[PDB]
Every structure is written in structure tokens, then in C-alpha cells.
Design a binder for this molecule. Structure first.
Ligand SMILES: *[C@@H]1O[C@H](CO)[C@@H](O)[C@H](O)[C@H]1NC(C)=O
Ligand SMILES: *[C@@H]1O[C@H](CO)[C@@H](O)[C@H](O)[C@H]1NC(C)=O
Ligand SMILES: *[C@@H]1O[C@H](CO)[C@@H](O)[C@H](O)[C@H]1NC(C)=O
Ligand SMILES: *[C@@H]1O[C@H](CO)[C@@H](O)[C@H](O)[C@H]1NC(C)=O
Ligand SMILES: *[C@@H]1O[C@H](CO)[C@@H](O)[C@H](O)[C@H]1NC(C)=O
Ligand SMILES: *[C@@H]1O[C@H](CO)[C@@H](O)[C@H](O)[C@H]1NC(C)=O
Ligand SMILES: *[C@@H]1O[C@H](CO)[C@@H](O)[C@H](O)[C@H]1NC(C)=O
Ligand SMILES: *[C@@H]1O[C@H](CO)[C@@H](O)[C@H](O)[C@H]1NC(C)=O
Ligand SMILES: *[C@@H]1O[C@H](CO)[C@@H](O)[C@H](O)[C@H]1NC(C)=O
Ligand SMILES: *[C@@H]1O[C@H](CO)[C@@H](O)[C@H](O)[C@H]1NC(C)=O
Ligand SMILES: *[C@@H]1O[C@H](CO)[C@@H](O)[C@H](O)[C@H]1NC(C)=O
Ligand SMILES: *[C@@H]1O[C@H](CO)[C@@H](O)[C@H](O)[C@H]1NC(C)=O
Ligand SMILES: *[C@@H]1O[C@H](CO)[C@@H](O)[C@H](O)[C@H]1NC(C)=O
Lengths: 343, 208, 209
């Protein structure tokens, strides 16, 4: 009937036309209102292949979120290419809202309902919908924030789990709250519950062993790169936070290790930078100092971006470090169960 | 993830259909690639995805196979194809196959050179054994001093194969102190090679 | 697509070296770059990759803590740092781009010309040249040295051997030539040796006695 094709999609949202917050403002003209009663139909006796890594929806979304950022957060100075841009750079309200993606007439979105679907392969329970669920376009590295959670078990998704050049997306079942605050007016910090976080690492390790074998799993910090990827970087209240995750990724998990082994709070030191490397584009951007007052944004940890060290193959252990930087992987973590077809 | 490339060396003349096999750890599917590098040059991709060719060099080059074993094939060997070949899977490389052209087995001529007077005066003695114009490249050179085999105190060097007669040549150099040199009488270089039915020994007596 | 690397450098053990990989001809940000070293004769060893856009890096095995891969996003040059230079690190180092746009496949089409790195606890010194027919060129540093016979007038029967590295950290090679035996009493033979790094040239006449 149908056959795979890529085309230009549109977005839908419940944005408020009166709001000054920039996601709302963009979505008010860029997207349509959500459907009160979205329809999902089970496709009886239908089996379908998905590939979350070659899904053009991600790229379309990417170009959209770039555009959203460009027209919302104007830097005092931009160095894209060899050309430098000076301009007015006012403070704005910036807090993500959910976005749904929908197919126009003649096209459709298929949705895999298989438990813990890895994103590549045959789905046994396929449905059709007119629109996706609402996805908040949270821009961050290392940790995925405010995303979707796995239903039953932690899920690992990779193009080649044994290819150390490939990113590894992890999806949790239970979310981990992260609480950040700004009281050197650039100094800040984020708290996560130690006990809550360690239980998480134990279960992630166990899941990872199913792919790499009955081996010791080590979590360590980033080996290098720009601060945006060597720290947990994200934005809050229009301000760019950069948080040290050394306290998070500094553990060794044997096959028999449990969080119970050997305040209950891990405090991560953070910094607010005005000079940042853009994710949209190669180049540097400079913003205005941070606005006065207490800045807070409590978030839900919903996923991880990891890489695995290479080397001369050696049983016993594997070492993993936080990564990211390509925001398409953030989008993939939400769009994995969808694909576009033409009718 | 772990490579084993056969054979370590090989020598076929212009035309002969060559076949290299690379076996690895369990399963790699089709993700094995094939390279080629000349003396003093960086390698070059020839075959990728276990079977596929790529733009550039001809499609007389080829590969086939799946799972664990794979084969790299040159249906019609030319002269400029004489280079070392390597198979690769992600981070892992094959041991490497040194290709060569075939030739009638030619025995080496062997020469021994004593240390010069000038050299001795400075506190060191170098003794040189020369192997000239031989084939195949494989050869054993053993230094003996008063019938005691010497090891770890010698170095070998080999020329690149000659463009006109397709032979190799080799030097071996034994280095000793003057004090040690003057303690012994008989200095000998013993050469083992496929073209010699038995080893050849050349020697001299100090002061003679 | 084209990758030019740094020139050959010779450092002392324990110190550190930096190798650059200048990139032209393609989208510098959308191609995973890898780094390889090749021991004299041995096959290639993987050191690590680095995704240029954010400097996202991945070191390997015994290199971790000794290696650092960085890039200068402008001028599009990539770097390879090697600290605590051991003797056995003496090799030629390579940078090679993964052919696949947006993604990895580990296909390596463009390669650097190779950066020759020598780790020797030695200082530059010209050779002594002794007679062996041939000439013995002993204890010089660094490479290279060239040798001719009779000012270029003799080009037949000559074999000039690859240098070796002595345990002293100095190089040595021999050059030999074959000639008719009847000429040794009548033909003059002179080897002409030039070692430009130390600006040393020697002409050494060689005879039986
Ligand atoms: C498909 O759905 C049925 C019923 O909802 C369930 O029993 C089955 O396990 C599902 N299949 C997969 C692969 O999850
Ligand atoms: C993902 O699951 C499918 C079955 O639904 C399987 O065919 C495929 O090999 C799996 N891929 C990975 C990378 O786990
Ligand atoms: C983080 O934890 C520290 C120490 O427990 C505490 O002083 C600080 O107020 C906490 N901040 C937040 C935002 O929870
Ligand atoms: C892993 O090792 C444990 C030892 O505690 C064993 O119980 C388990 O069966 C092993 N899993 C394998 C071999 O897949
Ligand atoms: C990672 O941990 C090491 C401890 O060995 C530390 O020296 C380094 O600064 C840490 N890196 C970052 C980016 O925090
Ligand atoms: C992160 O913190 C560790 C210690 O907690 C410190 O050594 C490291 O330098 C920090 N990283 C950055 C990028 O500041
Ligand atoms: C890392 O873990 C060790 C114990 O395994 C601990 O002593 C050290 O303080 C930890 N460092 C950080 C930054 O959490
Ligand atoms: C748990 O098992 C691992 C190997 O299975 C072993 O190395 C370790 O010692 C064990 N734990 C303790 C506390 O001994
Ligand atoms: C995640 O959602 C919460 C809403 O409770 C918000 O406060 C927070 O800023 C969001 N995270 C990011 C990174 O925007
Ligand atoms: C996720 O974060 C929000 C932030 O306010 C928090 O209220 C909520 O309790 C968190 N989720 C869970 C399951 O605790
Ligand atoms: C992992 O294995 C390597 C080599 O077997 C070893 O050097 C290293 O210490 C191991 N890691 C841990 C945490 O023991
Ligand atoms: C990548 O994964 C596929 C299956 O998902 C597998 O067939 C292939 O061998 C893998 N590539 C490797 C291991 O290099
Ligand atoms: C090489 O040629 C010789 C004859 O000179 C022959 O005996 C030998 O079998 C040949 N080797 C190969 C591999 O063809």
C-alpha cells in the first residue's frame, strides 16, 4: 500500500498566544492547536520495521528547534563562520512546552507499541495515529531531561552497541529529580538524591551487561572536549547552566555489586557562562550577564547519553562515560517509535 | 575486534590470482574493510562492507564471504600492486600480508668485514657481515665468537627488493667494546638460507 | 578531501609531543576523525577518535592519561598530544577521516602523509665514518644521511641500507658496492657522505692498507 518517503511535516501545540515566554511565542505562529481526542488504531496482523537512527522526522525537528532558538535567544555576539555579529541581546523568558508532530493529508505516522522496543527491527504491535504525543524540546547534554520514560525496563538504543563511535541512548523507568539553584554571581549547583541515583546506576549496569556480556561495568567522567559536553549543560530561565557530573560518574559495578554496598545527597558544582559554543551550528555566542534573583528549575532525569571506551579488547570490564552534543539524539529518544510513510 | 590474517607473507609473479583470508573473533557480519600500503606511504581503502568495491582502483579487486571468514582477491596481478595488504574491522587491524613477486631461488654471496684501525682506537669494534642479492627475503644470520653463539648484540638491515633483478640484500652488524674484542680470537658469520643446501660460514682471526 | 599532517619531529623520553592534522576539502564538522600509529614494520594501532564539532573524544587502552585529542575549530586543524614519551612510542602517526557523512562506518579514505616521531635521549651529532667494499657511518643523530660513491660517477652495484637505531639512541647504517676485483689496485674508490642536520660532510678514501 504505502511505501517509505520523507516529506515536510508541521507541528502542533497548546501554546498560549498571550504568553511572553519564547517557546509559546514561536509555537503560536509555527504550530496548530492539539486534538482533544487523538485517534490511535491498532493495525491487525501488521508487522513493520523501524529505524530510529534513519528517521527524517528527527532532522525536520532539528531544523525547527534551531529556528526556535535563533529567533528567541539573540546573543550579543555571534561567531558563525569567519563572520562576527554584534547586536542587541535582551533577556527573555525561556521554558520549553510540549510539541506534537503530525502528518498532513496523504501521509501517516506509525507507532510501535512493543514493550522496550530498541528502535531498529520488526515491531509486532503497530498502530496508526494522526499526531505524535507531546514532546518538550529540552536542549541538554549528558542527561536527557523532561523526556519520555520506558514502561517496564530500562532500554538501550544503539546503531551498533559494539561500535565505540556510536552514541548510546539510555531510557529510565523511574525518573531522578534534579534540583538546581543560583544563590561570584555566576556560581550555582544542582542536587540529586544519592540513594535514588545509585539504585538507578545498579539497574542500568545490569541492563548493559545483557549486551556486553557477564562483565564488570564502570562509569567514569568525560575524557575531554568542550565544556558543553564534558559537563551536564542545559538552559534555565534563559540562562545557560554548566554542571559537573564527576560526582555522578565515578563508580565501578561488579556483577554482584548493589547500591547498598560499603543527608543522602550528591551536590554537583555548576557554572553559568556567557560565552558558549552553539549546538545549532559551529561557532561561538556571547550573552548578557545573568538576571538578578534566585534561579531554579527542578527537572526529571529521563535518560542518558553514553559512549564506551575503545582499546585492545580485554574481557573483565567495560568503561562508560557521559557524552552527547548532537541534539538529534535527544529527539531520537522521543521519536524512535514513529516513522513517516506516504499513502 | 580481533584479527588473524593469512598468510603473513606471500610471493606471486605478475598475473597469478592471489587470495588472502582474514578470520576473526565470532561474528562481524560484513563490516570488514581492505587496505593497501606501499613503502613509505599511507594505506588506501580498496574494498569495504566485505564485498563492495569503491571508486578508484579497478574491480579486478574483490572480496566475498560472511560471518567469521573473508577473502580478498586479485584476479590479475600487475606490477604496481606489489604492496602490503591489511584487513580491518573498526578498531582492529589484520597482522598484514607482505606481497611479493616470484623468482628463481637465488643464493646470497657472503662477505665479512673486520673493524677498521680507526674504529678500534675510539673504543668500539663493529663487525659487518654482508648478504648480497638473494631470494627469498627470509634468511638467518648467526654471529659466533670462539664458537659461542652471540645474540642480542647484533642488528640486521635489508634493502628494498631491486627493481632490475628482484633480489634483496642484507647487512648484519655486531658491536663490541675494544676490551671484549681483544679477549677473543675467532670471529665468524654463519648464514642460513633456502638457496643453500647447508649453512655458509665466513670468519677471521684478530691480528691476522 | 585532504589531510595534511605535521612534519617529522624528534623528542626526548619523558617529554611531550604535539601532532597536527590540517583539514581541507570537506565538511570538517560532519566527519569522525581517527588516529593511528604504525610501529616500524608492525601493523596499525588505534589510538582514538574525535568528533570535531564538540571535540567529543575517545581515547583507548594504554593510551589513556598519555594522549589528548583536540581540534582548533577555526583553521579546522586537529591535534594529537602524547605525554610521557616512552622509547617504544617511536613510530609514524596517522590521522584518517571516516568516509561516512553523519555517522560511523570506519571507512578511512583520506590519510595523513604520516608524522615520523623518534623518541631518543640524544642530541644532534654528525657521524664518524670508518672503512670496511664500503663505508661505515656510525653514531649520528637525527636522520637522515645520504651517501654517494665517487661523486655520483659510480651508480652500479651500490646498495645503501636503511638506518638502524642503536641502544645508544644514535643511528647507524652501512653502504656497500660490488666491483671487479682486478680494479681494486688501480681504481680509486671514494664514498661521499653528507649529513645536513649537523652540516657534516665527509669524503673517505678506502683501500686495503
Ligand atoms: C502486543 O500486544 C499484546 C496485547 O496487548 C501483548 O500480549 C504482546 O506481548 C505485545 N507484543 C509485544 C512484542 O510487546
Ligand atoms: C532490536 O529488536 C529487534 C526485534 O524487535 C531485533 O530484530 C533487533 O536485532 C534488535 N536490535 C538491537 C540493536 O538490539
Ligand atoms: C543542595 O544540598 C545542599 C546540602 O545538602 C543544601 O545546602 C542546598 O540548599 C541544596 N540545594 C537544593 C536546591 O536542594
Ligand atoms: C554471570 O556470573 C554469575 C556468577 O555470579 C552467574 O550466576 C551467571 O549465570 C553468569 N551469567 C552468564 C554466564 O551468562
Ligand atoms: C574527571 O575526573 C578526573 C579524575 O581522575 C579529573 O582529574 C578531571 O578533571 C575530571 N574531568 C572533568 C571534566 O570534570
Ligand atoms: C569537576 O569536578 C572535579 C572534582 O569534583 C574537578 O576535578 C574537575 O576539574 C571539574 N571539572 C570542571 C570542568 O570544572
Ligand atoms: C570518586 O570515588 C572515590 C571512591 O571510589 C571517592 O574517594 C572520590 O571522592 C570520588 N570522587 C568524586 C568526585 O565523586
Ligand atoms: C563480587 O564478585 C566479583 C566477581 O564476580 C568479585 O571480584 C568481588 O570481590 C565480589 N565482591 C566482593 C565484595 O568481594
Ligand atoms: C523540565 O520541566 C520543569 C517543569 O516542572 C521545568 O521547571 C524545567 O525547567 C524543565 N527543564 C528544562 C531543562 O527546561
Ligand atoms: C519529576 O520532577 C518533578 C519536578 O517538580 C517532581 O515533582 C516529580 O515528583 C518527579 N517525578 C517523580 C516520579 O518523583
Ligand atoms: C579493568 O580491566 C583492566 C585490565 O584487565 C584493569 O587494568 C582495570 O583495573 C580494570 N578496572 C577495574 C575497576 O578494576
Ligand atoms: C552492527 O550491528 C549489526 C546488527 O545490529 C551486526 O550485524 C554488525 O555485525 C554490527 N557491526 C559490527 C559488529 O561491526
Ligand atoms: C616460483 O617459481 C619457481 C620456479 O622458478 C617455482 O618452482 C615455484 O613453484 C614458484 N612459486 C609460486 C608460488 O608460484
Amino acid at each position: 500500500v504505502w511505501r517509505d518517503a520523507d516529506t515536510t511535516l508541521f507541528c502542533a501545540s497548546d501554546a498560549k498566544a498571550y504568553e511572553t515566554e519564547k517557546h509559546n511565542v514561536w509555537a503560536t505562529h509555527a504550530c496548530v492547536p492539539t486534538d482533544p481526542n487523538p485517534q490511535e488504531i491498532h493495525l491487525d496482523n501488521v508487522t513493520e520495521k523501524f529505524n530510529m537512527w534513519k528517521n527524517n522526522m528527527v532532522e525536520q525537528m532539528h531544523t525547527d528547534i534551531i529556528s526556535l532558538w535563533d529567533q528567541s535567544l539573540k546573543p550579543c555576539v555571534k561567531l558563525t563562520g569567519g563572520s562576527a555579529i554584534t547586536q542587541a541581546c535582551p533577556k527573555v523568558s525561556f521554558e520549553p512546552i510540549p510539541i506534537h508532530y503530525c502528518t498532513p493529508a496523504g501521509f501517516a505516522i506509525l507507532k510501535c507499541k512493543d514493550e522496550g522496543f530498541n528502535g531498529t527491527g520488526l515491531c509486532k504491535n503497530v498502530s496508526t495515529v494522526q499526531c505524535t504525543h507531546g514532546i518538550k524540546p529540552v536542549v541538554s547534554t549528558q542527561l536527557l531531561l523532561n523526556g519520555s520514560l520506558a514502561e517496564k525496563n530500562i532500554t538501550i538504543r544503539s546503531e551498533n552497541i559494539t561500535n565505540n563511535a556510536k552514541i548510546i541512548i539510555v531510557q529510565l523507568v523511574q525518573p531522578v529529580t534534579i534540583k538546581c539553584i543560583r544563590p561570584d554571581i555566576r556560581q550555582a549547583h544542582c542536587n540529586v538524591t544519592r540513594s535514588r541515583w545509585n539504585k538507578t546506576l545498579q539497574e542500568v549496569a545490569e541492563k548493559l551487561r545483557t549486551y556486553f556480556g557477564n562483565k564488570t561495568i564502570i562509569f567514569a567522567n568525560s575524557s575531554g572536549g568542550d565544556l558543553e559536553i564534558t559537563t551536564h549543560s542545559f538552559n534555565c530561565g534563559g540562562e545557560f547552566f554548566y554542571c559537573n557530573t564527576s560526582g555522578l560518574f565515578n563508580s565501578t559495578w561488579y556483577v554482584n555489586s548493589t547500591w547498598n554496598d560499603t543527608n543522602d545527597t550528591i551536590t554537583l558544582p555548576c557554572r553559568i557562562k556567557q560565552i558558549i559554543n552553539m549546538w545549532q551550528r559551529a561557532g561561538q555566542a556571547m550573552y548578557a550577564p545573568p538576571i538578578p534573583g534566585v534561579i531554579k528549575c527542578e527537572s526529571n532525569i529521563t535518560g542518558l547519553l553514553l559512549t564506551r571506551d575503545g582499546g585492545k579488547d580485554n574481557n573483565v570490564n567495560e568503561t562508560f562515560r557521559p557524552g552527547g552534543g548532537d541534539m538529534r539524539d535527544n529527539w531520537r529518544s522521543e521519536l524512535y517509535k514513529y516513522k513517516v510513510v506516504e499513502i | 575486534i580481533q584479527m588473524t590474517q593469512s598468510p603473513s607473507s606471500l610471493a606471486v609473479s605478475v598475473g597469478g590470482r592471489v587470495t588472502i583470508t582474514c578470520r576473526a573473533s565470532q561474528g562481524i557480519g560484513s563490516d570488514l574493510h581492505w587496505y593497501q600500503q606501499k613503502r613509505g606511504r599511507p594505506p588506501k581503502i580498496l574494498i569495504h562492507h566485505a564485498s563492495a568495491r569503491e571508486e578508484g582502483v579497478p574491480s579486478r579487486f574483490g572480496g566475498s564471504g560472511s560471518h567469521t571468514p573473508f577473502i580478498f582477491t586479485i584476479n590479475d596481478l600487475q606490477l604496481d600492486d606489489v604492496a602490503t595488504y591489511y584487513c580491518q574491522v573498526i578498531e582492529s587491524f589484520g597482522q598484514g600480508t607482505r606481497l611479493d613477486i616470484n623468482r628463481t631461488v637465488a643464493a646470497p654471496s657472503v662477505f665479512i668485514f673486520p673493524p677498521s684501525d680507526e674504529q678500534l682506537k675510539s673504543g668500539t669494534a663493529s663487525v659487518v657481515c654482508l648478504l648480497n642479492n638473494f631470494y627469498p627475503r627470509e634468511a638467518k644470520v648467526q654471529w659466533k665468537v670462539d664458537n659461542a653463539l652471540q645474540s642480542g648484540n647484533s642488528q640486521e638491515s635489508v634493502t628494498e627488493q631491486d627493481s632490475k633483478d628482484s633480489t634483496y640484500s642484507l647487512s648484519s652488524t655486531l658491536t663490541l667494546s675494544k676490551a671484549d674484542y681483544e679477549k677473543h680470537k675467532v670471529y665468524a658469520c654463519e648464514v642460513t638460507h633456502q638457496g643453500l643446501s647447508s649453512p655458509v660460514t665466513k670468519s677471521f682471526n684478530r691480528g691476522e | 578531501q585532504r589531510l595534511v599532517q605535521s612534519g617529522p619531529q624528534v623528542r626526548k623520553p619523558g617529554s611531550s609531543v604535539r601532532i597536527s592534522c590540517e583539514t581541507s576539502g570537506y565538511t570538517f564538522n560532519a566527519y569522525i576523525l581517527h588516529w593511528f600509529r604504525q610501529a616500524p614494520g608492525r601493523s596499525f594501532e588505534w589510538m582514538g577518535w574525535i568528533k570535531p564539532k564538540f571535540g567529543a573524544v575517545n581515547y583507548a587502552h594504554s593510551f589513556q592519561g598519555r594522549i589528548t585529542l583536540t581540534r582548533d575549530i577555526y583553521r579546522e586543524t586537529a591535534f594529537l598530544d602524547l605525554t610521557g614519551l616512552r622509547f617504544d612510542d617511536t613510530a609514524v602517526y596517522y590521522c584518517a577521516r571516516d568516509r561516512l557523512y553523519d555517522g560511523s562506518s570506519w571507512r578511512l579514505d583520506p590519510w595523513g602523509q604520516g608524522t615520523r616521531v623518534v623518541v631518543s635521549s640524544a642530541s644532534t651529532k654528525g657521524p664518524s665514518v670508518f672503512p670496511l667494499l664500503g663505508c661505515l657511518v656510525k653514531d649520528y643523530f637525527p636522520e637522515p644521511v645520504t651517501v654517494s660513491w665517487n661523486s655520483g660517477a659510480l651508480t652500479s652495484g651500490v646498495h645503501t641500507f636503511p638506518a638502524v637505531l642503536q641502544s645508544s639512541g644514535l643511528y647507524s647504517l652501512s653502504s656497500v658496492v660490488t666491483v671487479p676485483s682486478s680494479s681494486l689496485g688501480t681504481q680509486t674508490y671514494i664514498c661521499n657522505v653528507n649529513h645536513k642536520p649537523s652540516n657534516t660532510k665527509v669524503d673517505k678514501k678506502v683501500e686495503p692498507k
